[PDB]
């Protein structure tokens, strides 16, 4: 194409052609824009493209071209500056400086090319980071002197100083070594008194709003680090809190400045000034922006100009200041109006419809009410504030997860993003209720009366109120709670008998279910009312009401989890414990529920049955509960034990899956008590597992791999997965491990291991690995031969599935390493039994796990390696440990170094560093007995410490050839010395990661500790 000419560096660069490609990229579209993009990236990436920057910045007509030139210079400065000849350094400096000067002396350029000037200032700052102050000592004095010669230069010097402060104090921790960060911070600190001089004189003297704003922007950055005397021993707080609050151009940045001052680090004069700038600021808001009565909800909703950002900034200022300093306002009676006016602005801000802003104000309210909860003599100050806050929160209650109806009185997806907000609203409302329980009840009862006989009936008026009522349960002591709940329930019962229609009924039913579900203490004390509630929920399980029926199931188990005892005992005036009544009607009660809801129902019944601690009576209840699935099970194992074709009935596959899902549900809540029911099905269940597995393999054989996607095979695999889930669930909660090992484990391994091993990869269930992990976790120490068999059947074939890329078979990947981790933890002997070839695959698999970006694999891999190193160390000076070190010590050292340095595994830095520190410390504690080198390689008697340093120096020399030998030797000397202090060790590694990104890093940096 025509545009690729600029990629040929043998010819002079045609600046006009560059400008066309740039304009094609920015203002063009489609194919030409994409072509130009690729050309420009290739141009930028050319390692000598910087040599053409002066020509572009001199002769170009396109500021985007000049921007791109400056980006090219930035990469050179940041990565290769110290490789350049000194004349090229001086030339680049003088050239960047002079370009900035000329843009600032041209009023027209200064006003129109802000983008290019800002990029130039940042480029200069990159030079400063390399050159200042050691090779530019006069930069700050000259900057200050040149500032008084031109308003434009002065304003731009404020941008440069702002950028320098950010680069030195805000963004240095990850971009510079510890030593270079300290150098530049100390350097700015040593000259800030001069900098502050110019900044204060501009603010007190200046009238150019653009210069003032830029000076204030730079001040915002300074406030992150400067000594407090510059803020309190000058007149600057008065300027910020009066003058610069009156003009809207400076108000935004000034407010942000004052927020940071509310964070600077016994002096009664200092307290007076902290009170004073707050008083000034609030006075300016009231007179210049809006009074405390103003409707900020409406103002925010209108979103004129920068009103939304200003209100956000005001909330941040008020919350920040008051959380730190409101005590200064609380004792002096002359400050009471200021304290309450500031909190009244916060009340008004809390009415804005803006979720993220509400969270910000809610965080403050939590801070306040938790202090009023404990601090003597404080809550009375805020009574009227807290009373208004009760109204705000009760009226902005969000949906409490358990409420499953919405919008058109229908169901949906979960409102994942409201979970934390509800919890935060509950927390504050609970505190507010403790602060004044009379006020809270009076508010709630009154809202409720105006839902029934009132002008306020609506959804979200009943809703947000019902949710608030449920959310405060536990705040009242038991007797007050008793009277309150009786009142609420009668009135909710009033609303539901009179509001008719699909929509009304669904709304009120959900609200009642939420409230009663939130007051189990009330239910425990009034058995007769608890019974009526449970029976009502059973009614709702037959509701055609989408939403209501699902919520009744959730509410049933939510109540049972808290009130289970009152179902297991025999209540006065009852013929039987109520668990008996539920079980006897379970077919009718659940007849119209969906299978997953049926399983929830059975799970709740299991919660109740486990309350019965008489073992004879508990087992009879379990047998009664499982009567329907067991009879279905007995019939289906009778039928399908002669016609493995009937097992191809989809209806039969669904029935079997649902039977096992039911057992899974009851086992989840009964745990170790489930064992008698498990034993009833165990043998036939594992026979069925084998039969189903034969069918799957036969289908794959007859139809191809595609068969695994068909509904039939997915249904058959669901049976296998649920059987595995049932066994895993029981064994994870089992209390009698002897029965687990002697009854369950051998038939399980016979049933599942060879089927996994002998299936094609696409037919292997990752749930086998998950089951085996729990088996090893619980009883692995008692089945050493069984752990070996597990490894033999799943290790090599699963590794071959997952060792070609990082993406395929993601579940097998995750379960594979959890299994290896627990085996390495619990039954390390199993790995000692491996043949050497297989143990080599084990090490390969661990290092493979390292290289995953998948946190679910990386973390276990790093942990396995650490545990393995420890496992080997525990063996002592024995042949296997000696051979391990000779074979794999340097493999683990280099593989760990590789993921530490490749910039693609930063999420594992801490555990990579831990593993590397453990490895190095092994050698510098002489915990390795044999030489790590070959007999030829180095003199006899060479310590492993000397050889390790030698090995690492060689490794880093070839892997990072742009480092000097002294950088590498200084790095290793520091790293080795620090192999007992993880935090210092880690800082040295971070220093290294900075240094490998550039040329000419100072080797003395590694002396920082």
């Amino acid at each position: 194409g025509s545009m690729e000419g600029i990629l040929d560096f043998s010819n002079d660069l045609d600046i006009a052609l560059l400008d066309q490609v740039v304009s094609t990229f920015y203002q063009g579209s489609g194919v030409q824009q994409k072509q130009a993009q690729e050309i420009l990236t290739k141009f930028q990436d050319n390692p000598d493209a910087w040599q053409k920057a002066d020509q572009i910045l001199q002769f170009s007509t396109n500021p985007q071209s000049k921007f791109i030139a400056l980006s090219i210079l930035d990469k050179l400065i940041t990565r290769k500056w110290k490789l350049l000849p000194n004349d090229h350094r001086i030339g680049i400096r003088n050239f960047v400086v002079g370009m900035i000067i000329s843009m600032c002396q041209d009023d027209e350029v200064f006003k129109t090319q802000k983008n290019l000037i800002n990029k130039s200032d940042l480029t200069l700052v990159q030079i400063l980071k390399q050159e200042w102050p050691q090779n530019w000592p006069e930069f700050i004095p000259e900057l200050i002197g040149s500032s008084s010669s031109s308003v434009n230069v002065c304003e731009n010097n404020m941008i440069v100083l702002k950028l320098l402060s950010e680069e030195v104090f805000d963004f240095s921790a990850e971009q510079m070594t510890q030593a270079k960060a300290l150098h530049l911070k100390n350097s700015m600190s040593k000259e800030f008194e001069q900098i502050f001089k110019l900044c204060f004189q501009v603010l007190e003297q200046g009238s150019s709003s653009s210069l003032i704003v830029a000076t204030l922007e730079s001040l915002l950055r300074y406030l992150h680090w400067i000594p407090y005397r510059y803020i309190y021993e000058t007149n600057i707080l008065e300027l910020l809190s009066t003058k610069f609050m009156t003009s809207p151009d400076t108000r935004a940045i000034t407010l942000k400045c004052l927020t940071e001052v509310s964070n600077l680090k016994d002096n009664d004069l200092i307290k007076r000034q902290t009170v004073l700038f707050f008083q000034n600021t609030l006075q300016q808001i009231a007179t210049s922006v809006m009074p405390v009565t103003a409707d900020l909800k409406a103002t925010y909703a209108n979103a004129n100009g920068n009103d939304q950002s200003f209100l956000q900034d005001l909330a941040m200022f008020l919350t920040t200041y008051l959380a730190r300093n409101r005590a200064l306002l609380e004792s002096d009676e002359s400050l009471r109006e200021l304290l309450l006016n500031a909190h009244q602005y916060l009340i008004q801000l809390s009415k804005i419809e803006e979720r993220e802003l509400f969270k910000t104000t809610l965080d403050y309210w939590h801070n306040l009410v938790a202090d009023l909860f404990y601090e003597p003599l404080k809550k009375h100050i805020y009574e009227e504030i807290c009373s208004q806050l009760r109204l705000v929160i009760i009226e902005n209650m969000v949906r409490p997860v358990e409420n499953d109806e919405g919008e058109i009185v229908r169901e949906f997806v979960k409102e994942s993003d409201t979970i934390q907000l509800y919890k935060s609203e509950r927390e504050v409302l609970v505190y507010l209720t403790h602060l004044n329980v009379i006020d809270t009840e009076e508010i709630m009862i009154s809202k409720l009366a105006r839902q029934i006989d009132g002008s306020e009936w609506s959804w979200h008026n009943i809703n947000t109120l019902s949710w608030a009522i449920g959310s405060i349960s536990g705040t009242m002591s038991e007797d007050t709670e008793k009277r309150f709940v009786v009142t609420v329930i009668k009135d909710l019962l009033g609303l539901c008998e009179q509001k008719r229609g699909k929509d009304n009924k669904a709304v009120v039913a959900s609200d009642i279910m939420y409230v009663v579900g939130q007051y189990p203490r009330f239910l425990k004390a009034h058995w007769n009312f608890l019974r009526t509630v449970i029976l009502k929920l059973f009614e709702f399980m037959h509701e055609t009401h989408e939403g209501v029926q699902d919520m009744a199931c959730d509410t049933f188990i939510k109540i049972v989890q808290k009130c289970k005892y009152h179902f297991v005992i025999q209540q006065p005036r009852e013929s039987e414990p109520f668990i008996q009544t539920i079980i006897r009607d379970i077919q009718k009660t659940t007849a119209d529920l969906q299978p997953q809801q049926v399983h929830t129902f059975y799970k709740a019944c299991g919660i109740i049955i486990s309350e019965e601690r008489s073992v004879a009576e508990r087992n009879r209840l379990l047998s009664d509960l499982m009567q329907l699935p067991n009879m279905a099970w007995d019939t289906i194992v009778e039928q399908s034990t002669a016609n493995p074709t009937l097992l191809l009935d989809s209806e039969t596959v669904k029935i079997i899956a649902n039977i096992i899902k039911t057992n899974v549900a009851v086992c989840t809540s009964m745990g170790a008590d489930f064992y008698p029911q498990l034993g009833h099905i165990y043998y036939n269940m594992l026979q069925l597992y084998r039969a189903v597995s034969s069918m799957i393999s036969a289908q794959v054989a007859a139809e191809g791999l595609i068969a695994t996607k068909t509904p039939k095979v997915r249904g058959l695999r669901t049976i296998k997965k649920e059987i595995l889930k049932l066994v895993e669930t029981y064994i994870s909660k089992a209390r009698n491990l002897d029965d687990v090992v002697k009854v369950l484990v051998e038939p399980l391994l016979n049933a599942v291991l060879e089927d996994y091993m002998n299936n094609v990869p696409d037919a292997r269930d990752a749930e086998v690995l998950n089951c085996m992990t729990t088996v090893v976790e619980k009883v692995g120490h008692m089945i050493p031969q069984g752990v070996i068999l597990i490894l033999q059947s799943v290790f090599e074939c699963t590794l071959d599935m997952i060792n070609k890329d990082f993406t395929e078979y993601p579940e097998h990947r995750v379960e594979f390493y959890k299994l290896l981790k627990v085996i390495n933890e619990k039954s390390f002997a199993a790995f000692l039994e491996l043949p050497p070839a297989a143990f080599k695959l084990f090490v390969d698999a661990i290092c493979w796990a390292f290289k995953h970006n998948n946190r679910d694999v990386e973390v276990n891999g790093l942990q396995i390696a650490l545990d393995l190193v420890k496992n080997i160390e525990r063996m002592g000076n024995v042949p296997f440990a000696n051979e391990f070190h000779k074979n794999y010590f340097f493999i683990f050292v280099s593989e760990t170094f590789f993921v530490l340095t490749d910039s693609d595994h930063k999420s594992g830095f801490s555990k990579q560093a831990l593993l590397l520190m453990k490895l190095i410390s092994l050698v510098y504690d002489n915990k390795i007995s044999v030489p790590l080198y070959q007999e030829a390689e180095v003199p006899q008697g060479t310590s492993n410490q000397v050889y390790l340093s030698q090995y690492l120096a060689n490794m880093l020399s070839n892997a990072f050839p742009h480092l000097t030998s002294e950088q590498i030797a200084s790095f290793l000397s520091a790293l080795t010395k620090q192999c007992k202090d993880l935090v210092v060790f880690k800082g040295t590694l971070r220093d290294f990661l900075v240094q490998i990104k550039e040329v000419g890093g100072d080797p003395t940096d590694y002396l920082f500790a």
Binding site: S650, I706, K709, T710, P711
Partner: protein, 122 residues
């Protein structure tokens, strides 16, 4: 919206796919309400389906009597069919569509409504 002179014969929540023959894989085109719309003037019944929350059209074509609903190997709650003139994204283009529903019963209901609409269009 250009749907005011049309009667809603049938509505069901669905997920629509389009087959990328070059990449040999199904790609989602939209999730939302699939509606069968009968034009009061012409008595012609079209499928019109819009995405939730953006309300963008992801299906807009006549339920032609020549179309045949066919099963997909992976699902008992989906239908595949060739459509020769869909205008969801501008000019009429041919697609191989798959549409999946929340349950087999919804899929079977969709099929009989689809066939009834074909008889109306005749």
């Amino acid at each position: 919206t250009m749907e005011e002179d049309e009667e809603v014969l049938y509505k069901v929540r669905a997920k629509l796919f389009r087959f990328d023959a070059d990449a040999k894989e199904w790609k989602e085109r939209g999730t939302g309400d699939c509606k069968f719309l009968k034009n009061k003037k012409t008595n012609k019944v079209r499928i019109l389906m819009r995405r939730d929350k953006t309300l963008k059209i992801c299906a807009n074509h006549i339920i032609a009597p020549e179309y045949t609903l066919k099963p997909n190997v992976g699902s008992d709650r989906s239908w595949v069919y060739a459509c020769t003139a869909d205008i969801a994204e501008g000019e009429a283009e041919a697609f191989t569509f798959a549409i999946r529903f929340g349950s087999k019963e919804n899929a079977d209901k969709f099929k009989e409504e689809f066939e009834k609409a074909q008889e109306i269009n005749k």
